[PDB]
mmCIF file of C-alpha atoms and ligand atoms in Angstrom:
data_model
loop_
_atom_site.group_PDB
_atom_site.id
_atom_site.type_symbol
_atom_site.label_atom_id
_atom_site.label_comp_id
_atom_site.label_asym_id
_atom_site.label_seq_id
_atom_site.Cartn_x
_atom_site.Cartn_y
_atom_site.Cartn_z
ATOM 1 C CA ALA B 2 -15.993 7.397 -23.668
ATOM 2 C CA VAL B 3 -19.166 9.002 -25.249
ATOM 3 C CA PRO B 4 -21.442 5.804 -25.256
ATOM 4 C CA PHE B 5 -20.205 4.963 -21.676
ATOM 5 C CA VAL B 6 -20.915 8.482 -20.306
ATOM 6 C CA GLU B 7 -24.471 8.474 -21.899
ATOM 7 C CA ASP B 8 -25.346 5.519 -19.618
ATOM 8 C CA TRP B 9 -23.006 6.150 -16.662
ATOM 9 C CA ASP B 10 -22.833 9.313 -14.600
ATOM 10 C CA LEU B 11 -19.237 10.244 -13.630
ATOM 11 C CA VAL B 12 -20.637 11.517 -10.290
ATOM 12 C CA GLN B 13 -17.450 12.878 -8.725
ATOM 13 C CA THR B 14 -13.695 12.597 -8.400
ATOM 14 C CA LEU B 15 -12.666 9.964 -5.884
ATOM 15 C CA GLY B 16 -8.978 10.846 -5.895
ATOM 16 C CA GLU B 17 -5.954 11.887 -7.871
ATOM 17 C CA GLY B 18 -2.370 10.985 -8.686
ATOM 18 C CA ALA B 19 0.207 12.546 -11.077
ATOM 19 C CA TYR B 20 -1.023 10.462 -14.090
ATOM 20 C CA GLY B 21 -4.640 11.478 -13.656
ATOM 21 C CA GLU B 22 -7.766 10.986 -11.527
ATOM 22 C CA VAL B 23 -10.130 8.288 -10.195
ATOM 23 C CA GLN B 24 -13.869 8.938 -10.837
ATOM 24 C CA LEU B 25 -16.962 7.319 -9.371
ATOM 25 C CA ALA B 26 -19.128 5.973 -12.209
ATOM 26 C CA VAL B 27 -22.806 5.053 -11.545
ATOM 27 C CA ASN B 28 -24.949 3.341 -14.202
ATOM 28 C CA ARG B 29 -28.175 5.369 -14.567
ATOM 29 C CA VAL B 30 -30.382 2.249 -14.960
ATOM 30 C CA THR B 31 -28.833 -0.315 -12.607
ATOM 31 C CA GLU B 32 -27.201 2.088 -10.115
ATOM 32 C CA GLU B 33 -24.112 -0.189 -10.174
ATOM 33 C CA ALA B 34 -20.999 1.823 -9.088
ATOM 34 C CA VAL B 35 -17.472 1.260 -10.478
ATOM 35 C CA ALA B 36 -14.305 3.288 -10.051
ATOM 36 C CA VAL B 37 -12.692 4.641 -13.216
ATOM 37 C CA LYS B 38 -8.978 5.442 -13.228
ATOM 38 C CA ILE B 39 -8.302 7.915 -16.030
ATOM 39 C CA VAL B 40 -4.672 8.295 -17.240
ATOM 40 C CA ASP B 41 -3.369 10.833 -19.781
ATOM 41 C CA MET B 42 -0.563 8.896 -21.466
ATOM 42 C CA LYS B 43 0.972 12.230 -22.742
ATOM 43 C CA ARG B 44 2.238 12.942 -19.176
ATOM 44 C CA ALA B 45 5.428 10.943 -19.951
ATOM 45 C CA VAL B 46 7.062 9.115 -22.935
ATOM 46 C CA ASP B 47 7.230 5.864 -20.895
ATOM 47 C CA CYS B 48 3.580 6.166 -19.657
ATOM 48 C CA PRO B 49 2.228 3.794 -22.428
ATOM 49 C CA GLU B 50 4.679 0.991 -21.314
ATOM 50 C CA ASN B 51 4.076 1.713 -17.615
ATOM 51 C CA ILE B 52 0.237 1.499 -17.861
ATOM 52 C CA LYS B 53 0.673 -1.699 -19.971
ATOM 53 C CA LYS B 54 2.683 -3.159 -16.982
ATOM 54 C CA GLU B 55 0.075 -1.966 -14.398
ATOM 55 C CA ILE B 56 -2.747 -3.606 -16.434
ATOM 56 C CA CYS B 57 -0.662 -6.795 -16.848
ATOM 57 C CA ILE B 58 -0.124 -6.992 -13.050
ATOM 58 C CA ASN B 59 -3.792 -6.159 -12.368
ATOM 59 C CA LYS B 60 -4.871 -9.104 -14.633
ATOM 60 C CA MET B 61 -2.883 -11.526 -12.365
ATOM 61 C CA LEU B 62 -4.715 -10.505 -9.168
ATOM 62 C CA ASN B 63 -7.588 -12.352 -7.425
ATOM 63 C CA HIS B 64 -7.739 -12.065 -3.634
ATOM 64 C CA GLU B 65 -10.212 -10.782 -1.010
ATOM 65 C CA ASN B 66 -7.691 -8.158 0.199
ATOM 66 C CA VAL B 67 -6.805 -6.765 -3.238
ATOM 67 C CA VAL B 68 -8.995 -4.307 -5.276
ATOM 68 C CA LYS B 69 -10.674 -6.232 -8.154
ATOM 69 C CA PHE B 70 -9.702 -5.146 -11.686
ATOM 70 C CA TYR B 71 -12.556 -5.444 -14.236
ATOM 71 C CA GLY B 72 -10.943 -4.301 -17.466
ATOM 72 C CA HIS B 73 -9.641 -1.377 -19.413
ATOM 73 C CA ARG B 74 -9.768 0.438 -22.736
ATOM 74 C CA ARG B 75 -7.888 3.141 -24.600
ATOM 75 C CA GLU B 76 -9.585 6.170 -26.320
ATOM 76 C CA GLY B 77 -7.000 8.238 -28.103
ATOM 77 C CA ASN B 78 -4.112 9.033 -25.633
ATOM 78 C CA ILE B 79 -6.347 8.355 -22.555
ATOM 79 C CA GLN B 80 -6.302 4.994 -20.714
ATOM 80 C CA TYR B 81 -9.423 3.971 -18.695
ATOM 81 C CA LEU B 82 -9.056 1.289 -16.006
ATOM 82 C CA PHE B 83 -12.232 -0.043 -14.402
ATOM 83 C CA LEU B 84 -11.971 -1.138 -10.808
ATOM 84 C CA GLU B 85 -14.097 -2.369 -7.934
ATOM 85 C CA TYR B 86 -15.520 0.689 -6.051
ATOM 86 C CA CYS B 87 -14.352 0.615 -2.459
ATOM 87 C CA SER B 88 -17.095 2.540 -0.702
ATOM 88 C CA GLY B 89 -15.272 2.687 2.669
ATOM 89 C CA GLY B 90 -12.620 4.957 1.140
ATOM 90 C CA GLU B 91 -8.924 5.279 2.030
ATOM 91 C CA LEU B 92 -7.446 3.792 5.202
ATOM 92 C CA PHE B 93 -5.731 7.223 5.466
ATOM 93 C CA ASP B 94 -9.105 8.779 6.414
ATOM 94 C CA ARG B 95 -9.619 6.380 9.399
ATOM 95 C CA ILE B 96 -6.429 7.752 10.931
ATOM 96 C CA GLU B 97 -7.003 10.723 13.285
ATOM 97 C CA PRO B 98 -3.986 13.093 12.959
ATOM 98 C CA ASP B 99 -1.686 12.753 16.032
ATOM 99 C CA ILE B 100 -4.038 10.107 17.535
ATOM 100 C CA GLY B 101 -4.442 7.204 15.178
ATOM 101 C CA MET B 102 -7.294 4.826 15.760
ATOM 102 C CA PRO B 103 -8.378 2.244 18.431
ATOM 103 C CA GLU B 104 -5.780 -0.567 18.896
ATOM 104 C CA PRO B 105 -8.391 -3.410 17.943
ATOM 105 C CA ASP B 106 -9.086 -1.574 14.649
ATOM 106 C CA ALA B 107 -5.396 -1.146 13.782
ATOM 107 C CA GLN B 108 -4.805 -4.884 14.583
ATOM 108 C CA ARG B 109 -7.698 -6.010 12.324
ATOM 109 C CA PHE B 110 -6.550 -3.805 9.411
ATOM 110 C CA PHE B 111 -2.941 -5.036 9.974
ATOM 111 C CA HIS B 112 -4.113 -8.714 9.723
ATOM 112 C CA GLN B 113 -5.917 -7.910 6.438
ATOM 113 C CA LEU B 114 -2.896 -6.022 5.128
ATOM 114 C CA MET B 115 -0.658 -9.028 5.914
ATOM 115 C CA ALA B 116 -3.157 -11.370 4.108
ATOM 116 C CA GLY B 117 -3.016 -9.153 0.999
ATOM 117 C CA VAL B 118 0.804 -8.786 1.002
ATOM 118 C CA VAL B 119 1.285 -12.603 1.591
ATOM 119 C CA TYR B 120 -0.927 -13.167 -1.473
ATOM 120 C CA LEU B 121 1.029 -10.695 -3.688
ATOM 121 C CA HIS B 122 4.413 -12.040 -2.534
ATOM 122 C CA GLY B 123 3.137 -15.669 -3.119
ATOM 123 C CA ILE B 124 2.509 -14.848 -6.816
ATOM 124 C CA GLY B 125 5.961 -13.035 -7.016
ATOM 125 C CA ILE B 126 4.520 -9.448 -7.066
ATOM 126 C CA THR B 127 5.908 -6.596 -4.955
ATOM 127 C CA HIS B 128 3.645 -3.571 -4.460
ATOM 128 C CA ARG B 129 6.461 -0.928 -3.728
ATOM 129 C CA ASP B 130 4.037 1.829 -2.613
ATOM 130 C CA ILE B 131 2.241 0.509 0.479
ATOM 131 C CA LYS B 132 0.744 3.471 2.376
ATOM 132 C CA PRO B 133 -2.689 4.388 3.877
ATOM 133 C CA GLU B 134 -3.640 6.318 0.657
ATOM 134 C CA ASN B 135 -3.211 2.991 -1.284
ATOM 135 C CA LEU B 136 -5.198 0.819 1.120
ATOM 136 C CA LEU B 137 -8.947 1.027 0.502
ATOM 137 C CA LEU B 138 -11.948 -0.223 2.385
ATOM 138 C CA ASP B 139 -15.026 -1.923 1.052
ATOM 139 C CA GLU B 140 -18.642 -1.499 2.405
ATOM 140 C CA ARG B 141 -17.845 -3.876 5.363
ATOM 141 C CA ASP B 142 -14.555 -2.078 6.154
ATOM 142 C CA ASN B 143 -12.399 -4.923 4.710
ATOM 143 C CA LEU B 144 -9.000 -3.712 3.596
ATOM 144 C CA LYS B 145 -8.076 -3.879 -0.068
ATOM 145 C CA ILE B 146 -4.625 -3.167 -1.494
ATOM 146 C CA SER B 147 -4.860 -0.682 -4.350
ATOM 147 C CA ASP B 148 -2.696 1.322 -6.843
ATOM 148 C CA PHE B 149 -0.359 -1.169 -8.603
ATOM 149 C CA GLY B 150 1.283 1.604 -10.732
ATOM 150 C CA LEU B 151 4.676 0.898 -9.008
ATOM 151 C CA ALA B 152 4.245 -2.910 -8.698
ATOM 152 C CA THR B 153 6.667 -5.327 -10.363
ATOM 153 C CA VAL B 154 7.551 -9.057 -10.556
ATOM 154 C CA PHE B 155 10.447 -10.051 -8.224
ATOM 155 C CA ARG B 156 10.124 -13.861 -8.669
ATOM 156 C CA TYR B 157 9.810 -15.752 -11.992
ATOM 157 C CA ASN B 158 8.459 -19.165 -11.229
ATOM 158 C CA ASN B 159 10.741 -20.219 -8.275
ATOM 159 C CA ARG B 160 13.614 -17.819 -9.143
ATOM 160 C CA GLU B 161 14.014 -14.462 -7.322
ATOM 161 C CA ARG B 162 15.667 -11.381 -8.787
ATOM 162 C CA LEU B 163 16.955 -8.391 -6.824
ATOM 163 C CA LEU B 164 15.483 -4.929 -7.427
ATOM 164 C CA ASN B 165 17.275 -1.627 -7.821
ATOM 165 C CA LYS B 166 14.586 1.026 -8.460
ATOM 166 C CA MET B 167 14.260 3.852 -5.941
ATOM 167 C CA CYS B 168 10.553 4.320 -5.854
ATOM 168 C CA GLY B 169 7.687 4.679 -3.463
ATOM 169 C CA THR B 170 6.709 7.429 -1.047
ATOM 170 C CA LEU B 171 9.820 8.539 0.957
ATOM 171 C CA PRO B 172 8.476 8.304 4.646
ATOM 172 C CA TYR B 173 7.364 4.740 3.825
ATOM 173 C CA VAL B 174 10.556 3.689 2.015
ATOM 174 C CA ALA B 175 12.946 1.111 3.576
ATOM 175 C CA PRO B 176 16.524 2.337 4.363
ATOM 176 C CA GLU B 177 18.147 -0.125 1.907
ATOM 177 C CA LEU B 178 16.623 1.948 -1.029
ATOM 178 C CA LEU B 179 18.955 4.760 0.196
ATOM 179 C CA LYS B 180 22.005 2.547 0.955
ATOM 180 C CA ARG B 181 22.175 -0.529 -1.317
ATOM 181 C CA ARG B 182 22.540 -0.705 -5.104
ATOM 182 C CA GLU B 183 20.324 -3.816 -5.208
ATOM 183 C CA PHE B 184 18.017 -5.362 -2.618
ATOM 184 C CA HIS B 185 15.394 -8.029 -1.979
ATOM 185 C CA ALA B 186 11.837 -7.030 -2.736
ATOM 186 C CA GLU B 187 9.890 -8.577 0.212
ATOM 187 C CA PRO B 188 11.617 -6.808 3.161
ATOM 188 C CA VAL B 189 10.838 -3.417 1.472
ATOM 189 C CA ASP B 190 7.066 -4.141 1.522
ATOM 190 C CA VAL B 191 7.423 -5.492 5.151
ATOM 191 C CA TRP B 192 9.033 -2.146 6.149
ATOM 192 C CA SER B 193 6.269 0.014 4.579
ATOM 193 C CA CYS B 194 3.653 -2.212 6.381
ATOM 194 C CA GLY B 195 5.462 -1.303 9.628
ATOM 195 C CA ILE B 196 5.183 2.431 8.825
ATOM 196 C CA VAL B 197 1.443 1.982 8.112
ATOM 197 C CA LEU B 198 1.070 0.232 11.518
ATOM 198 C CA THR B 199 2.925 3.126 13.209
ATOM 199 C CA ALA B 200 0.550 5.650 11.513
ATOM 200 C CA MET B 201 -2.603 3.656 12.518
ATOM 201 C CA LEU B 202 -1.456 3.415 16.117
ATOM 202 C CA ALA B 203 -0.293 7.031 16.740
ATOM 203 C CA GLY B 204 -1.550 9.106 13.729
ATOM 204 C CA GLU B 205 1.906 10.421 12.886
ATOM 205 C CA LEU B 206 4.726 9.376 10.526
ATOM 206 C CA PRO B 207 7.936 8.833 12.505
ATOM 207 C CA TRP B 208 10.460 10.384 10.102
ATOM 208 C CA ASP B 209 10.845 12.235 6.790
ATOM 209 C CA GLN B 210 13.061 9.395 5.585
ATOM 210 C CA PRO B 211 15.201 6.568 7.029
ATOM 211 C CA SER B 212 18.513 8.226 6.092
ATOM 212 C CA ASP B 213 21.708 9.221 7.820
ATOM 213 C CA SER B 214 20.759 12.891 7.700
ATOM 214 C CA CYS B 215 17.359 12.382 9.436
ATOM 215 C CA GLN B 216 17.507 13.026 13.209
ATOM 216 C CA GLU B 217 14.147 11.328 13.833
ATOM 217 C CA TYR B 218 15.479 8.130 12.218
ATOM 218 C CA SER B 219 18.727 8.365 14.316
ATOM 219 C CA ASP B 220 16.443 8.703 17.404
ATOM 220 C CA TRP B 221 14.686 5.458 16.569
ATOM 221 C CA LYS B 222 17.997 3.611 15.888
ATOM 222 C CA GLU B 223 19.013 4.812 19.390
ATOM 223 C CA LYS B 224 15.861 3.270 20.920
ATOM 224 C CA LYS B 225 14.393 6.661 21.963
ATOM 225 C CA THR B 226 10.848 5.289 22.283
ATOM 226 C CA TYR B 227 10.002 7.956 24.906
ATOM 227 C CA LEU B 228 9.691 10.420 21.973
ATOM 228 C CA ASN B 229 6.702 10.859 19.620
ATOM 229 C CA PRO B 230 5.191 8.871 17.911
ATOM 230 C CA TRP B 231 6.615 5.909 19.926
ATOM 231 C CA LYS B 232 5.591 7.127 23.355
ATOM 232 C CA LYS B 233 1.897 6.962 22.306
ATOM 233 C CA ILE B 234 2.374 3.256 21.316
ATOM 234 C CA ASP B 235 1.777 0.423 23.784
ATOM 235 C CA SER B 236 4.771 -1.835 24.471
ATOM 236 C CA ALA B 237 3.121 -4.942 22.850
ATOM 237 C CA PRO B 238 2.684 -3.383 19.283
ATOM 238 C CA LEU B 239 5.914 -1.396 19.789
ATOM 239 C CA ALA B 240 7.825 -4.762 20.278
ATOM 240 C CA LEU B 241 6.461 -5.783 16.813
ATOM 241 C CA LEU B 242 7.564 -2.413 15.331
ATOM 242 C CA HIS B 243 11.062 -2.978 16.816
ATOM 243 C CA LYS B 244 11.231 -6.210 14.715
ATOM 244 C CA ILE B 245 9.834 -4.659 11.496
ATOM 245 C CA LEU B 246 11.717 -1.369 11.442
ATOM 246 C CA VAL B 247 15.138 -3.032 11.520
ATOM 247 C CA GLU B 248 17.762 -1.213 9.353
ATOM 248 C CA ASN B 249 19.490 -4.412 7.958
ATOM 249 C CA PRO B 250 16.887 -6.040 5.656
ATOM 250 C CA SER B 251 18.491 -9.489 6.187
ATOM 251 C CA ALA B 252 17.853 -9.143 9.983
ATOM 252 C CA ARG B 253 14.263 -7.722 9.529
ATOM 253 C CA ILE B 254 11.285 -9.860 10.532
ATOM 254 C CA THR B 255 9.647 -11.828 7.666
ATOM 255 C CA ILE B 256 5.845 -12.129 7.357
ATOM 256 C CA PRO B 257 5.799 -15.850 8.623
ATOM 257 C CA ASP B 258 7.465 -14.523 11.854
ATOM 258 C CA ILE B 259 5.093 -11.437 12.061
ATOM 259 C CA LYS B 260 2.257 -14.023 12.187
ATOM 260 C CA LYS B 261 3.988 -15.472 15.359
ATOM 261 C CA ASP B 262 4.297 -12.062 17.069
ATOM 262 C CA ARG B 263 2.642 -11.718 20.523
ATOM 263 C CA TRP B 264 0.802 -8.449 19.689
ATOM 264 C CA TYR B 265 -0.257 -9.799 16.242
ATOM 265 C CA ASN B 266 -1.890 -12.702 18.142
ATOM 266 C CA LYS B 267 -3.111 -10.652 21.100
ATOM 267 C CA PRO B 268 -6.878 -10.864 21.937
ATOM 268 C CA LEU B 269 -7.919 -7.222 22.244
ATOM 269 C CA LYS B 270 -11.111 -5.520 23.624
HETATM 270 N N1 D4Q C 301 -11.023 1.568 -6.687
HETATM 271 C C1 D4Q C 301 -11.548 2.566 -6.012
HETATM 272 O O1 D4Q C 301 -12.719 2.531 -5.526
HETATM 273 C C2 D4Q C 301 -10.706 3.753 -5.696
HETATM 274 C C3 D4Q C 301 -9.400 3.988 -6.274
HETATM 275 N N2 D4Q C 301 -8.604 4.982 -5.905
HETATM 276 C C4 D4Q C 301 -9.033 5.919 -5.065
HETATM 277 N N3 D4Q C 301 -8.160 6.912 -4.753
HETATM 278 C C5 D4Q C 301 -6.765 6.884 -4.981
HETATM 279 C C6 D4Q C 301 -6.143 8.284 -4.980
HETATM 280 C C7 D4Q C 301 -4.648 8.200 -5.079
HETATM 281 C C8 D4Q C 301 -4.059 7.326 -3.949
HETATM 282 N N4 D4Q C 301 -4.646 5.974 -4.053
HETATM 283 C C9 D4Q C 301 -6.090 5.992 -3.918
HETATM 284 C C10 D4Q C 301 -10.304 5.774 -4.403
HETATM 285 C C11 D4Q C 301 -10.915 6.596 -3.392
HETATM 286 C C12 D4Q C 301 -12.181 6.158 -3.053
HETATM 287 C C13 D4Q C 301 -13.054 6.715 -2.012
HETATM 288 C C14 D4Q C 301 -12.732 7.939 -1.372
HETATM 289 C C15 D4Q C 301 -13.586 8.448 -0.360
HETATM 290 C C16 D4Q C 301 -14.733 7.787 -0.034
HETATM 291 C C17 D4Q C 301 -15.058 6.591 -0.707
HETATM 292 F F1 D4Q C 301 -16.171 5.924 -0.351
HETATM 293 C C18 D4Q C 301 -14.273 6.070 -1.675
HETATM 294 S S1 D4Q C 301 -12.589 4.712 -3.889
HETATM 295 C C19 D4Q C 301 -11.093 4.736 -4.754
#
């Protein structure tokens, strides 16, 4: 990227994954900032096909609560993806450990998260890695869904398909990924949104994983909401969490019903 780096200063690393890093690029003349995701395709034999899929998915996106994708180019074995710079950073860094954030803030971010997820689901895309590290903020603190490296199509025109890949970040993963051979895509993203809401409200993830061998998950199935993180959560958002974090995905609340929830619609301070 020799001509590009002559005109653009790769000022600093914004973040990192396993595939590579995200850099802040600032044009020396215009001072325009863009984020550059740099991926070494030699990290895995299937990395060229996976990055092709991420770019393909990125090209389909156009929504106020999704990070804008500008383009990409390959230079040898390195892939460069150019994205809208989200100067508010990760939602993760608005979460005070063991505290969370004010309830009106968490509600506003949750509404924006639902708008982004409704959009993705409406075009038949599932994110599969919703977590505060993958939710960015722009200069006005509007939430933007980011990192589509695990995203896939679950509906072709008006025909759904089930998914079977165990992927995502384990404390955010729905229990059906650990119990069913195949499962519907939408309830999985609904579940991870519920874990994000829990983290925003109490600054703590509730369990290592929603599995049989996890005591913290058994505690939640047993309605022990007098234990952390639940005891830090007001009854109104907790009632919504009781509908989202439902073990059976067919009984789990859908996004149209989340939009009808009392706390979701609650006028806060
Ligand atoms: N498109 C982007 O702008 C972008 C993309 N990826 C990022 N990081 C990854 C790391 C792995 C997990 N997913 C997010 C970040 C971090 C950013 C940031 C951080 C601190 C302050 C600040 F103002 C901005 S911006 C940005």
